[PDB]
Write the C-alpha cells for this entry.
Amino acid sequence: SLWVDKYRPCSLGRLDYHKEQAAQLRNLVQCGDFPHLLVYGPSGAGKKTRIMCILRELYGVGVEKLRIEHQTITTPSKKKIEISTIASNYHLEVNPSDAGNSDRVVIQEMLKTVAQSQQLETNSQRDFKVVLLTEVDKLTKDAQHALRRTMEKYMSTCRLILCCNSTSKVIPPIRSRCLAVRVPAPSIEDICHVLSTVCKKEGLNLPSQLAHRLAEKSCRNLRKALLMCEACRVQQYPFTADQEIPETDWEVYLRETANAIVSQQTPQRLLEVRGRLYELLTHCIPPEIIMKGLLSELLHNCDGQLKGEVAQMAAYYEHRLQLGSKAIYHLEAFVAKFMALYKKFMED
Amino acid sequence: SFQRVVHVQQKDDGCCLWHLKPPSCPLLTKFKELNTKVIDLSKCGIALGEFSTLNSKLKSGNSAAVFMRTRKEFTEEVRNLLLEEIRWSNPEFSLKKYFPLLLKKQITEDMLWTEKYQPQTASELIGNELAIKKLHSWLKDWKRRAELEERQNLKGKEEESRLCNTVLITGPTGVGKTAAVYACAQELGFKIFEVNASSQRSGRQILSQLKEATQSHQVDKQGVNSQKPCFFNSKNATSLILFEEVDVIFDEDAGFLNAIKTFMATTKRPVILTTSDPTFSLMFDGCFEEIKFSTPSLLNVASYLQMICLTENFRTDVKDFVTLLTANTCDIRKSILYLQFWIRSGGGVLEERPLTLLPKCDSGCAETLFGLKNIFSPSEDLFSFLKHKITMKEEWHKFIQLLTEFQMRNVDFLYSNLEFILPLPVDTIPTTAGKKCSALVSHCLNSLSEFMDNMSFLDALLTDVREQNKYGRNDFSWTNGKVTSGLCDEFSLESNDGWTSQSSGELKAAAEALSFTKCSSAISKALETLNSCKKLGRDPTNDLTFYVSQKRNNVYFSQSAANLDNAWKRISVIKSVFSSRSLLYVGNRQASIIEYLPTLRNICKTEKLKEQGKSKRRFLHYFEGIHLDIPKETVNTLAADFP
Amino acid sequence: HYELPWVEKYRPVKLNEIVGNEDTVSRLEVFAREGNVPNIIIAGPPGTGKTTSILCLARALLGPALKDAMLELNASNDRGIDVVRNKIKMFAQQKVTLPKGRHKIIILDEADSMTDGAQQALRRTMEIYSKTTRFALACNASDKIIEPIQSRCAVLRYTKLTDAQILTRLMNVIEKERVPYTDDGLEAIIFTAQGDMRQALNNLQSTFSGFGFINSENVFKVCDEPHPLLVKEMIQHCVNANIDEAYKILAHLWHLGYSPEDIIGNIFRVCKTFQMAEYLKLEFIKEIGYTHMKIAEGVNSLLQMAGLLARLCQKTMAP
Amino acid sequence: KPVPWVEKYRPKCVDEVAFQEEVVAVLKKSLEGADLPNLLFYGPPGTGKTSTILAAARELFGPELFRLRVLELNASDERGIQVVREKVKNFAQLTVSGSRSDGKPCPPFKIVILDEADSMTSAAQAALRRTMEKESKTTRFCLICNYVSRIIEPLTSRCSKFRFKPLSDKIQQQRLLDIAKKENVKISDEGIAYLVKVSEGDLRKAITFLQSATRLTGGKEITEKVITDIAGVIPAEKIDGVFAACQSGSFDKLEAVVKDLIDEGHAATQLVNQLHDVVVENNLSDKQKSIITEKLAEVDKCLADGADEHLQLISLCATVMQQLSQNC
Ligand SMILES: Nc1ncnc2c1ncn2[C@@H]1O[C@H](COP(=O)(O)OP(=O)(O)OP(O)(O)=S)[C@@H](O)[C@H]1O
Ligand SMILES: Nc1ncnc2c1ncn2[C@@H]1O[C@H](COP(=O)(O)OP(=O)(O)OP(O)(O)=S)[C@@H](O)[C@H]1O
Ligand SMILES: Nc1ncnc2c1ncn2[C@@H]1O[C@H](COP(=O)(O)OP(=O)(O)OP(O)(O)=S)[C@@H](O)[C@H]1O
Ligand SMILES: Nc1ncnc2c1ncn2[C@@H]1O[C@H](COP(=O)(O)OP(=O)(O)O)[C@@H](O)[C@H]1O
Ligand SMILES: [Mg+2]
Ligand SMILES: [Mg+2]
Ligand SMILES: [Mg+2]
C-alpha cells in the first residue's frame, strides 16, 4: 500500500482539485439515473480515483471489499481464453483489450454474465451493476460495434463506465450516448498541494520549492509525482532543497540511446541502437511510448528546420507501427531514416 | 398490389441547385470518345518459358541420387575420438556417465527412438535436475511410508513430515514429465495407473473403477509388476495414480475435477498430475506439491542428440542440432522423432570435417527440417545461394519458394540473419580520402535504411498469412499469452478468407526477396570501390562491421534476431512482482508498468546502495515496513541494474 | 465403359513416379523399402501429391495386408471425439500379424478439419501404441494442428511443384493419351495451374474433352481466366507510363466480368515473371500488394484498380 | 425507472413533426389505406426520420401492440448478416394475434425498422434484398440512412424514398425552449443558441447534451462552460492559440501548445475538426488550403486507425506552420 494507494481518496468531498467536477458528479448520482460514463484524460490525471469515488458515492461501502477472479470463455473459433477480473458484489471491472483482436467476446459474453448475475442478485439498493471497462481506447472496431449493440441491449440491467486516454479510436455512435467526463491533468499547484497534504499525513514537512520541482518534473502526472516523492523519501529522511528527483530508469536508458544515435552515424551504431531498442521493448513498454520519448529526446539536438520533417516522419512511422504487427521494423526504420536525414544534413 | 414507391423529395422552388444544367465550359464538353479496341490475342501465341521457368534444356543425371548408404560400425578408437570431441565441445557435460547406458540401450527394429531410448532411471534424464530430484525424494518417501505400513501390518499379525499426497508437475511440451514419472516409478518399483485424455474419464467411471486402487493393496505383488494399466472403459510394488494431461476436459468428462478432488481427499497411495498448461496451477483448488520443469539447456540436449547419433554410428557437429533445437524450441520429443526419421533415411550430405578438439560429417539436418532440400539442389548450400548474386529465373523461383516456406510460419528469415547474409564483415562482441570513406558509409547506410523501410512497408501495408495478435496482443506483454488450444469438439464455423493467405504469402515473399536483392546489390557495388579507399590508407571497416551476440553465432541461422530467454526472465519478473497482494489492484495496465516498475527498481537499487555502506539493519525494512510482500529473489533482481 | 478422370486414371502407383519434392519422396522411398516408419505429418499446398505419397508408402509397406492393417479416416468421415476415443484406440489395440519392421497404419487425411478436442485426445493414443500402430497424417496449414501432435510427429514439408516437373508429367500423360497439342497450350496449362498437378490434369482433360486441341486459345476458353497477354500489355503500358491504354485494357477486363480478386492475382502472377528492372519490379510488387490488401479488406471497385494503375505509371516517371 | 429525454418528447403520431410537408402527407395517405409500403428515409441525423417512422408505427398499430409488432435492428452487427437474417427470419416467422378496442383491426404485416442501412456491403445488400423478397407481403421493411447513393440499385428501386432536410436553427431553438420550460430548467437564450451551434444542426445531440447538463448541474443555470465540456467542443481561444503558434513559425511554442491541448484532455479528432472548419473558411490561398486539408485528411485517417494523438497533432501543426510561414 504505497502513497498512491494508501492515501487514495474514496469520497467525492476529498478531491482537492476539480471540486466543481466532483460536485457535478455527486449531483448527477443524486438523481439516480446516471448514464454510461466515458471518462477521458491523460494517464495520471486521476480517472481511476474519480471512478472509485463515484462508485463509493453510488453504492455503499462494500465496493472496497473486492475480489480477484479469472474468467475463461470459448472463442467462436472454439478456443479457451482466460482473463483476470477485479470484481465485487456491487460492481465488476474487466479490462477487455487483453484478448488482442478477440476483444469482442470479453465485451459481449462477460456483459452477459454481469446481466445474469444482476438478474440473480437482489439487494434493494440499486437496479444496475456497474461494469468498468478500463482502457477502452485500444479496442478494435469490430469489438466496439459489439460494445455498441450491447449497450443498446443491456442498458436496463447494467451501467457502463468506460475509461480511456483518448476518444480518437472510439467510434462516434459510442460517444453519442455516453456522458463525457473530461478529466484534465491537474495543474502544478494542485500537485504541490497534494504532495504537501500527503507528506503532512506521513509526519514529514517538505518545502514548497521541492514540491514545485517534483510537479514540474512529473509533467502533470500525479501518480508519477507521488512515486517520485516516495523514492525521494527513501533516499533522504529530510526533504532537502538539494534533493535529487529520482529519474525514470528506462527514460534515461532512452536518453542514452538518443545520445547513441546522435553521436555516431554508422550502420554499426544503427545495429547497437537496434539492440538497445530490443532490450527496451522486452521490458513490455508499449511502442508508442518509446516513439514519443525518442521524438522528445532527438528534437533537442536538431535545429528548427529539421524539426517539422522529423515530426512528420515520426507520425508516419508511428501510424505504420500501429497498423503493423512487429513494432521493431517501424521503429528501427524510423531510426534509419532519421540517421540518413541527419547524415545528409550535417554534411552540408 | 405493386403500389407506387415514389421518391418524395422536399424540393422547394429556388436554391439554384435542384434543377441544374451541364456546364458551358469547354473542358467538360470535350468528352473523349470511348475506344474498345484491344489487341487481338489469336495472332500472338504464348511462347514456351514466357510466364514460367520453362527451359528447352533439361538437367539429367544431377538429381535422383540414391544413397544406398551402408554405414560401417564404428570401432573403439574412433568412437573414443568422437567422445573426446563432444567433451571438448561441451566441457560441462558428464559424458562418461551416460555412454554405457545408451550402449546398453542399443544392445529390423520395431521401436520408435522415443521408446528405444526411453530413460529407465531418473538419473539418465537430461536437464531439470532439481525437479527430478524433488520427484525422486517424494516418491522415495512414499515408498518408505508403504514399507513402514507393511512393517506395521506384519507386526500387528503428519505435519512434521509434511507429506502431501499429490505432486502437480507443470512444464513445456516434451520436456520429459511422463518420462520422469515413469523413470522414477521403474527405479523404485512403483506401479502406475495412468488416466489419459484418449480415454473416457468421467467422474463416476474413474471413482468406481480406480478408488480401490488407492484404498486397497495389490493382489499381485511379486513377478510382473512393472506394467502400466492404462485405465479405460468402452520386492512388493506400491500403487501410484497418474493423470496425464489433466487440463484437457471435455463435455463427456462430466465432473472429472470433483472426482480427482475426492481422490485428493481419500487417498492412501501417491497421486501424480501431469499438465503442460501453466494456468491449471491457479484454477485447481486443492493442496498439492508443485514441481516445475524448466526448458532444458540447449547445449546439453544437443550433446545428448549428438550422442544418440553416435550410438547409431554416425558422426556430426553440435551447431546443427543447436539450430534444430532452436527451431523446435528445445522440444526433446520432436527432435528425437525427427532425428530418427533423418538418421534412418541414410543421411543428407556427405561432407568431411577434420576436427580434433575419421568418418565424414553429416551436417544439414536443419535444412531438410524446414524442407529447404526440396527446393535446392543437393550441391547447393543455403548461405552460398544467399550470398552470391541471383540472376537466373530458377534461382529467383528458389528464393521465392524459400521465403514462402518461411512466411507461412510468420518468421522473417532474411531479417533474423541480416548480419550473416549481407556482404559485410561480422565480428563477435567482446581530407578527400575521409570524404570518400564517409560517402561509402553513407551509401551503405542509405541502402540499409531503404531496405528497412521496405520491411516496415511489408509488415504494415501488406497482409500477413496468419493474423497476428489474434488471441493475445503483440509480443512482450504481461496481460496474458497462455492461450491454451481448443477443448470442445464443436467446429469453428468461422468465415475467414482463404485466398488472401497464399496470395499474401507470395506477395510478401516476392517483395522481401526483391528488396533484399536491391539492398545487397547496393552494398556490393558500394564496397567494390573499397579497394581504392584501402589503397588511400584509410580503412572504414571498423564502421562497417556488424556486432552480434555470441548466442546467435552458435547457430547456422536464426528464426529470431532477439533473445527469448531475456524476455522470459523479464516477463517472469513483472508477473511475479505484480502478483503481490497490495499491488494486485492496479488496473490501468500501461500506467502500472511504466510508473510502478522503474520506481520500484529505483527503490531496490537505493536499498542495496544503503546496505553496501554498512549502515543500520533497519534500512532493509522499508519493503516490509509498508506491508509490500515482495519475495527477496525478485527484489534482488530489481536491485541489479537496468539492461 | 466409364470415363475415369485423368486425375484418377493416371494417379501414381509407386513412390518413384511422384514428381516434385525429391528429398522427401526419396526418404519416403527408403522408408517404404526398409520399414519402421515414424509418425509423419506431411504438409504442403493442395495438389502436390501428399495423399498419393502416403497411399503409396502404405501400400509398399503393407502389401497384401493393406485391407486389414490400414485404417483410413478422411474429412468426409466423422472423426469426432468419440471416434478418436473408440475406433482409433480399438484399431491401435487390435492384434494384426505383420512381418518384422511393419506396423499398422492409421491414415488421417486433412488433419486441418480435425477439431482440437479430437487432437487433444489423439495425443496419448499416438504416443503409447507406437509399438504396433503408426500414424500418417496430412494437412495444408500445419498451424491448424495443435502443438502436441507436431511434438508427437515428424513434420515433412511439401513445396509447390516446379514448372519443369509439371511439364514432364503433363508430357507423360499426353504421350500416353495421344493428345494433339502445341507448346502454347503447354504454357497456358502450366500458367492456369500454379504448381498444381491436379488442376493441370483437370484443365487438360477439360479442354481435350471440350475442343479436342491443345493451344492457348482453347485452354483460356475452358479455364476462363483473364488473358495473360492482356495483363502483360497492361504491365508493358505501365512500364512506358501510358495510363490511357492501360486503363483502356483494364476497363475491357472489368466489363468482361472479372472480379477484382482474380484480376489483381493475374496482375501479380504476370508481373512476377515480367522482363523489367529489379528496382521497378520491387516497387511494382509493393504497390500491387498494397492494392491487393485493399481488395482483401473489403474495398473493391474500379477506382482502386485504376489508382493502382496510376501508381504503377508514376513509379516510372518519378525518380 | 425514468426514460431518457430523446424518446420522451418525440411526437406520438403523424402530422406532429414540423417542417415536413409532403413526407407526412404521403405517410398519412399510406396510413389511411392501412398499408405501408417498403420505406426508405434518408437525411442528416437529428432530423426526425426515426421519429416519423415510430410515429407511423404507433398510429397504424395500437400502443399495446406497438412494441410487439415492430423490431428495431442495426446493420452494423459484427457477425456479418447471418445473425441479422436469422433475427429477421425469427421475427417474421413468429406471428402475434392482436385486437384493437379503438375500432380498427391491426394490419397483418410486421415492421422491421433497420437503422444505418448505408453502412452495408453489396453482398449483404443483395442478401437483404432476397430476404425482403422472401417476406414481401408479410413484413414491410424500413431503411434509415443519411446517404441514399450507398444503397445499391434493387433495394433502392423497390422502396418508397423520402428526403429529410435538416431543421433550421430557429425551429430547433424554439423546440429546445419548449423542452427547457417543460422540464423546469433555468435557461437563457444564449445557452440554447450555443447548444444548437455545438450540436452542428443535430437535434438529438442537442437534446442529449441538454439532459446531460441539467443532470450534471442539477438545480442550477446552464452556462457555456458545462455545454462546452459536455459537447467535447474545444474552446475557440485554444484554436486561436494553435493558429497563432503555427503563424509564429517557432517549433518550441508549437510543442508547448499541443502539450497544453493534450494534457487538458482535449480529443485530437475534435481539434482536427475545428482546425479544418477554421482553415476552409479563411483568407488562405488555395494551395495552402489544399496542402493543409490533405494533411488533415491523412491525420484523421491515422486517428481513426488509432495512432498516437500527440505525434499526429505535432505533424499536422508542423505542416500548417510550414505552409503558413512559406509565404513569409
Ligand atoms: N529430458 C529428457 N531426456 C531424455 N529423453 C527425453 C527427455 N524429455 C523427453 N524425452 C524423450 O521424449 C519422450 C516423450 O517424452 P514425454 O515425457 O512423453 O513428454 P511430455 O513431458 O509428456 O510432454 P507431453 O506429454 O507431450 S505434453 C520420452 O520417452 C523420451 O524418449
Ligand atoms: N507429385 C506428383 N506426381 C504425380 N502426380 C501427382 C503429383 N501430385 C499430384 N499428382 C496428381 O494429382 C492427383 C491428386 O493429388 P493428391 O495427392 O490427391 O493431392 P493432395 O497432395 O492430396 O492435396 P490435397 O488432397 O488437395 S489436400 C494424383 O492422383 C495425381 O494424379
Ligand atoms: N421536425 C421535427 N419535429 C418533431 N420532432 C423532431 C423534429 N426534428 C427532430 N425532432 C426530434 O429530434 C429527436 C431526434 O430525432 P430522431 O428522429 O430520434 O433521430 P433522427 O432524426 O432520425 O436522426 P438519426 O436517428 O440519428 S439518423 C427526436 O426526439 C425527434 O422527436
Ligand atoms: N484528490 C486527490 N488527492 C490526492 N491524490 C489523488 C487525488 N486524485 C487522484 N489522486 C492520486 O493520483 C493517482 C492517479 O492515478 P489513477 O487514479 O490511476 O488515475 P489515471 O487512471 O488517470 O492514471 C492515484 O493513484 C491517486 O492516488
Ligand atoms: Mg505427458
Ligand atoms: Mg488428399
Ligand atoms: Mg433512429
